[PDB]
Amino acid sequence: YTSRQKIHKDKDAEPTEFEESVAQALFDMENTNQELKSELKDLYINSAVQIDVSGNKKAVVIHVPYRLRKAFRKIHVRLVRELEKKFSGKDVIFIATRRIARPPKRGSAAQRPRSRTLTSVHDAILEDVVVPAEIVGKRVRYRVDGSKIMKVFLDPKERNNTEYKLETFSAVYRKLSGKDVVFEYPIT
RNA sequence: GCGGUAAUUCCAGCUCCAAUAGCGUAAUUUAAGUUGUUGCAGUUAAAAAGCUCGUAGUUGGACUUUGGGAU
Ligand SMILES: [K+]
Ligand SMILES: [K+]
Ligand SMILES: [K+]
Ligand SMILES: [Mg+2]
Ligand SMILES: [Mg+2]
Ligand SMILES: [Mg+2]
Ligand SMILES: [Mg+2]
Ligand SMILES: [Mg+2]
Ligand SMILES: [Mg+2]
Ligand SMILES: [Mg+2]
């Protein structure tokens, strides 16, 4: 089969050139690499986007089906390290696709699951962005000027894997939810 | 509170004071945060049932869409 099977855009939309490039990269990863050949046969991405994080640096965010989030997680590290070498120093982020439902209008009898609330989806996205790190604390500081800055504490165990991705995580989260977040490692 | 033999307080004279064609005397408001919703009290001044349960009544933790771009 072709690489088009690795990309499934919503409503069968036509992907851009970056989606095609990422799908091709995944296809060659499945084919050439034997260790990941078994895992990647039934894995496809919903969409792929590019976000700039700093001068002369950029990051690529890949959205994957919700039902395959566990499968992607169990192979996250190898896949990210293999894909990074192909984009010339661009970090790769996997975020499961989720739907946000607006609150029911006042007086309506419609009920919305709490998982579909904006806050729950934002928390899930924040949990997914720092993979493989695990969040161990959260602080929100309300500045005098009226701005909010959130501090997220990550487990030091994944320091070697996450330390260099902090700025990319901040930029990606800001783009995805418009929230200012900083990452720090507890001292101990 | 005055008056019991030196009475600014009674009975009078004089003088003086308040209001003034008005003034005195015999339900109700304010003052009253002395009925307190605003806004009172309950150790010793009046005051929390000997103790617990308990239906009416009153009261009841947190959580679900924020932000920027612009205009
Ligand atoms: K006498
Ligand atoms: K006398
Ligand atoms: K008198
Ligand atoms: Mg006399
Ligand atoms: Mg006289
Ligand atoms: Mg009293
Ligand atoms: Mg007594
Ligand atoms: Mg008493
Ligand atoms: Mg008693
Ligand atoms: Mg009784």
Give the CA A176 to C1' B28 distance in Å.
Answer: 76
Rounded Cα–Cα distance for residues A39 and A159 (Å): 26
Nucleotide nearest to A111 (CA to C1'): B64
Q: Is the peptide bond before A132 cis (omega within 30 degrees of 0)?
A: yes
CB of residue A117 closer than 7 A to nucleic acid strand B? yes
- To what resolution in angstroms was this structure determined? 2.4
Cβ-count burial A169-178 (b if 16+ within 10 Å, e if not)? bbbbbeebee
Rounded Cα–Cα distance for residues A62 and A46 (Å): 8
Which string of DSSP letters, residue by residue, matches chain A? Answer: --GGGGB--GGGPPP-HHHHHHHHHHHHHHHH-STTHHHHTT--BSEEEEEEEETTEEEEEEEE-GGGHHHHHHTHHHHHHHHHTTTTS-EEEEEE-----PPPPTT------GGGSHHHHHHHHHHHHTTTS-EEEEEEEE-TTS-EEEEEEE-GGGHHHHGGGHHHHHHHHHHHH---EEEEPPP-
Give the CA A117 to C1' B35 distance in Å.
Answer: 54
Nucleotide nearest to A120 (CA to C1'): B64
Rounded Cα–Cα distance for residues A7 and A19 (Å): 7
Token output for A150: 């959130």
Give the CA A187 to C1' B61 distance in Å.
Answer: 33
Rounded Cα–Cα distance for residues A119 and A99 (Å): 12
Residue A118's alpha-carbon distances to A122, A140, A162, A168, in angstroms, are 6, 17, 26, 22
Nucleotide nearest to A100 (CA to C1'): B65
CB of residue A112 closer than 7 A to nucleic acid strand B? yes
List protein-proximal bases of chain B (any atom < 7 A from a CB).
63-68
**Residue entry with tokens 């902090």:** A166
Instruction: Let me know: does A27 contact A3? Beta carbons within 8 Å.
Output: yes
Cβ-count burial A96-132 (b if 16+ within 10 Å, e if not)? bebeeeeeeeeeeeeeeeeeeeeeebbebbbebbbbe
Experimental method: cryo-EM
